[PDB]
C-alpha cells in the first residue's frame, strides 16, 4: 500500500531534444469497449480462445439435474483446495483442476483406481463446477484438448448454488515493484532503440502501442 513508486525506467521525452529514431514509436492505446466488467475468459486477451469456450449451463438447469439426474450427465466439481469446500453439490464427482491434465491420459481401469469412479465416455455430457467458474473453464479446455464432444461449464458454480462468496484465487502474475524488467538490464539491442522502446508518452498505468515503422506526413505541410 501507500503508493509504492516503481523501479521501471519508463520516461516521457524532454522539452529540448528533438524527436528521433522513428523505427520504434510509442503511442497511447485505447480500445473500443471496456472488458473489465466481463468474465475473465471473454476479455480482449482471451479472444483467440473464443471457440474453445465451453457452453454455459445455467442455474435452473442445475436445479433440474439436482431433482432429475441423468445416468450419463456427469457433474464434476473442479474445486482444488479442500479447505474452501464446505457443502456437496448433488450427483457430483471430485476431479481437481490441478490433476485434469494427468487424469484424462489414464485408461478405463486406472481412472477407477486413481479416482474411485468410472471414466466417462467421450460421447456423454460433462458439466464442470467451480467457485467463480475459472477452474472449471481451465479444466474445460483440458477436457476439450482430449476428444470429449460435450464439455459444459457452469460459471459461478459454488458461489451461486450455495450462496457462498469465494474465489479460485488466480494470482494473475504481475511483477513486484522491486523486480526490474528485461529491457533496462541488457545489451540485446542498440542504444538508440533501447532509449526509444523505454520511452512512453504519458502515465505508465495505461496501455500503449509500439509502432514498428513511421513515415513523415509531408502532405499536411
Amino acid at each position: 500500500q501507500a503508493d509504492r513508486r516503481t523501479r521501471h525506467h519508463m520516461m516521457v521525452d524532454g522539452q529540448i531534444n528533438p524527436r528521433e529514431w522513428f523505427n520504434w514509436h510509442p503511442k497511447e492505446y485505447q480500445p473500443w469497449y471496456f472488458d473489465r466488467h466481463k468474465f475473465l475468459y471473454e476479455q480482449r486477451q482471451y479472444a483467440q480462445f473464443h471457440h474453445l469456450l465451453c457452453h454455459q449451463v445455467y442455474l435452473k438447469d442445475m436445479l433440474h439435474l439436482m431433482r432429475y439426474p441423468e445416468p450419463y450427465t456427469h457433474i464434476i466439481d473442479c474445486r482444488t483446495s479442500t479447505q474452501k469446500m464446505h457443502r456437496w453439490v448433488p450427483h457430483s464427482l471430485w476431479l481437481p483442476r490441478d490433476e485434469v491434465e494427468y487424469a484424462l491420459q489414464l485408461s478405463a481401469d486406472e481412472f477407477l483406481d486413481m479416482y474411485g469412479f468410472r471414466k466417462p465416455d467421450k460421447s456423454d455430457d460433462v458439466i464442470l463446477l467451480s467457485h467463480n467458474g475459472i477452474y472449471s473453464e481451465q479444466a474445460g479446455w483440458e477436457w476439450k484438448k482430449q476428444f470429449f464432444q460435450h464439455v459444459y461449464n457452469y460459471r459461478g458454480g459454488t458461489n451461486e448454488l450455495f450462496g457462498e462468496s469465494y474465489s479460485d484465487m488466480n494470482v494473475s502474475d504481475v511483477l513486484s515493484p522491486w523486480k526490474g524488467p528485461f529491457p533496462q538490464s541488457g545489451v540485446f539491442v542498440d542504444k538508440w532503440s533501447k532509449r526509444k522502446v523505454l520511452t512512453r508518452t504519458g502515465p505508465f498505468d495505461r496501455q500503449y502501442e509500439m509502432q514498428d515503422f513511421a513515415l513523415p506526413d509531408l502532405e499536411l505541410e
Binding site: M66, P90, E160, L161, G163
Partner: peptide, 16 residues
C-alpha cells in the same frame, strides 16, 4: 463453516 444470505439448493432440499 459459512452462513450464506441466499441459497438455491436448500429450499429444494427441505420439501424433499
Amino acid at each position: 463453516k459459512s452462513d450464506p444470505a441466499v441459497d438455491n439448493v436448500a429450499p429444494l432440499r427441505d420439501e424433499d
